[PDB]
Amino acid sequence: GPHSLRYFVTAVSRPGLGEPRYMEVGYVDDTEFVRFDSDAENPRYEPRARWMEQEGPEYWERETQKAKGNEQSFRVDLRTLLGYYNQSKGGSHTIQVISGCEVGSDGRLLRGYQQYAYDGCDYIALNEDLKTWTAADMAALITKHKWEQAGEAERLRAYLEGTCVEWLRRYLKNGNATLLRTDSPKAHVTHHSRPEDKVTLRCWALGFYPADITLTWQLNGEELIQDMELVETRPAGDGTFQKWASVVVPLGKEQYYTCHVYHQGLPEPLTLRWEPPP
């Protein structure tokens, strides 16, 4: 399928408490592979996917120094935005960036992007065309004209169309062209009391990777989305994820309901019912 190289940047000021916190995290298809954190004892670019241990000490030395230079830019950004938004030097503020490219199965670019946020709100973004910016408020307007003047979009474009793409392919190499590691869900149903002529059937999907999954409850072929309770998918802490969906049903009609689990690791979706222990 498609593939992605994304970098997620965070700089957060903390007046009084010391210099801005600065973080760079890299992702190949949602999988974190490098990370920098300026609050570490020794601030360097560190491998986070063991397949990254393939790169030579130069790589790390040179991306570390890149992080340090980025930290300076964002630290100055923080100061600049206090001017733009007339904000106090004593408050805590956050800058975020998501930057990256998606290339196709053929290895061609399908989309370059770079998005900025300030205190959690969109600030400015590069358009589909890789040529123009979309500002979200008056302050971002000032940024947009400066960058248009400097032609920054042409320079970003070159990164996205080239550098980004080539390393994406390169990282895909090392981490295997389309690393679909896969643990299919182990599913089961539990049974729980309700205001007592009612019962709760809870369908569990456990130990699965990756996070994408779908559980449904069916009554005579129909999907009960109204009345289903769902939790957000969550990490077990060991690399896999968990989810459940529950349904409140009349006492004694448990066998009228079926749970369905859909996941790229499943040859065929799972079908299951409440089983009274034989």
Binding site: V9, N70, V76, E152, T163, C164
Partner: peptide
């Protein structure tokens, strides 16, 4: 690798 960022 990441982009070399300039200032806003």
């Amino acid at each position: 690798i990441n982009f070399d960022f300039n200032t806003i």
